[PDB]
């Protein structure tokens, strides 16, 4: 329950639970390229890259190469996102872009053929520019119905093949960097009222889509739907200091509790936020609280560099930033009453000059996975799957191509964009084969 995580602040295992669910993920803007090919409409990131920044993986034209990389790793699932403006170029559900539909349908067919489970993310930051220009995007509560219409079409066209759905990837960053820091599209700065209005509409849009899925599609399709929430971790500078511990709790509440309390908790924002942020935080009606709570069939958790870098991504409140994924999972278990957890994104990054010998990625993966195994076996945390991030090198948002996060290397100056397994691809392949660390 709300506040219980504060208690957390006061290689023993090789093999994961039998038939643990191993996977890997991408986002559409990071890997697809072909930003206006075949009638795809522009996203807010297409516009942002032109204004604020100065082909990528070409996944749109190299589907068979991505599939071969997935086969090499041997994953049981592949998380990817659908580019909304590739499917509906103006965001509204007028005539679908047939080549966009064909791409996602062919990808899903290829996964089903391989008995690889798709995990499909509806929104990974690429809002159709038409919705931003006409309404102000997520600032406008008209977005809730427009998003639900898009979700509805996706459930109808893809839900017989897709059994795991994610509405929104890391809504914290959508709101906070999109409208607070300006570091992400659409690049608005200050406007703290907009930050929390955007967060409010993301939560309400998510809830509407969960209720849509629960009522209209789950009975025949028998799948699961969640939302990927990201966080950092943090530790007190002075272990016995109750003020440092309180600030650690406030830090986690400010990033993760903001979105998880309404969806996974009691249906309302964290009480401390509702008071200090009273002039900017929208108020859930009593009817809305009942509709926000319980709108996630599992807890999807992101723990990666986007929640640590750059420095303005979150408030440390004078404490000590930590990469302790085991403790972060314990915080989730305590705050949100021991839910089933998918690690929907985990990994780190290298400088782009590191091509295939990504030794630090293996070091990070070993430590993260050991922490997950300890969380499962010592803390009884209900982690059922792990998404390595990312399948291949791509465009990394404001960092562009200056960092790499793929398990497969891509030479962006090569026309063929061959996916070359890095050291971490060989390592993760063996992890999956042995269901954990080598025996």
């Amino acid at each position, epitope marked *: 329950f709300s506040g219980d995580g504060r208690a957390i602040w006061s290689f023993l295992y090789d093999t994961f639970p039998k038939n643990f669910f191993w996977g890997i993920g991408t986002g559409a803007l990071q890997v697809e390229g072909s930003w206006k090919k075949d009638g795809k409409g522009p996203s807010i990131w297409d516009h942002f890259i032109h204004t604020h920044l100065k082909g990528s993986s070409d996944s749109y034209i190299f589907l068979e190469k991505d599939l071969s990389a997935l086969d090499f790793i041997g994953v049981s699932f592949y998380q990817f996102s659908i580019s909304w403006p590739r499917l509906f170029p103006d965001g509204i559900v007028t005539v*679908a872009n047939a080549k966009g539909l064909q791409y996602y349908s062919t990808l899903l067919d290829a996964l089903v053929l391989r008995n690889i489970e798709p995990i499909v993310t509806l929104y990974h930051w690429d809002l159709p520019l038409a919705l931003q220009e006409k309404y102000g995007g997520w600032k406008n509560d008209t977005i809730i119905d427009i998003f*639900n219409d898009y979700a509805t079409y996706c459930f109808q066209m893809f839900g017989d093949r897709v059994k795991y759905w994610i509405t929104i990837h890391n809504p914290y960053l959508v709101a906070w960097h999109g409208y607070g820091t300006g570091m992400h599209a659409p690049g608005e700065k200050g406007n703290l009222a907009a930050v929390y209005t955007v967060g409010h509409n993301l939560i309400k849009a998510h809830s509407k889509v969960w209720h849509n899925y629960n009522t209209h599609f789950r009975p025949h399709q028998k799948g699961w739907l969640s939302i990927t929430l990201g966080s950092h971790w943090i530790e007190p500078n002075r272990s016995e200091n109750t003020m440092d511990i309180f600030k650690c709790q406030q830090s986690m509440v400010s990033v993760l509790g903001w979105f998880a309390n309404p969806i996974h908790g009691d249906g309302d924002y964290p009480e401390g936020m509702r008071k200090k942020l009273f002039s900017v935080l929208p108020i859930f009606s009593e009817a809305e609280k009942h509709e926000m709570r319980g709108t996630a069939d599992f807890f999807a958790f992101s723990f990666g560099p986007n929640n640590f870098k750059p420095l303005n991504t979150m408030a440390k409140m004078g404490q000590n930033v930590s990469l302790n994924l085991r403790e972060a999972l314990n915080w989730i278990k305590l705050e949100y009453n021991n839910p089933r957890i998918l690690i929907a994104e985990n990994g780190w990054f290298t400088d782009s000059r590191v091509k295939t010998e990504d030794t630090t990625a293996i070091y990070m993966m070993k430590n993260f996975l050991s922490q997950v195994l300890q969380a499962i076996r010592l803390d009884e945390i209900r982690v059922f799957g792990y998404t390595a991030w990312s399948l291949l090198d791509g465009f990394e948002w404001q960092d562009a191509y200056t960092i790499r996060r793929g398990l497969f290397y891509v030479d962006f100056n090569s026309k063929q964009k061959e996916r070359k397994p890095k050291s971490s691809a060989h390592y993760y392949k063996q992890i999956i084969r042995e269901n954990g660390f080598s025996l």
Partner: nanobody
Amino acid sequence: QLVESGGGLVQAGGSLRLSCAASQSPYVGGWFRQAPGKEREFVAAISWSGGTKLYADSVKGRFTISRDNAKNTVYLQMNTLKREDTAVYYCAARRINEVLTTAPDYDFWGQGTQVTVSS
């Protein structure tokens, strides 16, 4: 499964609201019409959640489509009616949440309701 209501006689410049009640999954609600001597033509349609409303050019800015899913009803508010709006109006439905203007893409149809606009 689809039941129109609200047709009838009205004077030129007047208003009429048509409604279409379903009997119960999501659907796009559509309206078509057929005038004497002419083929059935698209009028307006609305997505499941109401975010996408589409109108034939001949009625854009005069007709307004809306829906109340709690009542399983789609509404067509027809204002500034003209003589050439006289027709049998058919409501229609399409399951896939994609708002199209083509009659072959709607697989559920009503019986039709006469609307007559005088001068």
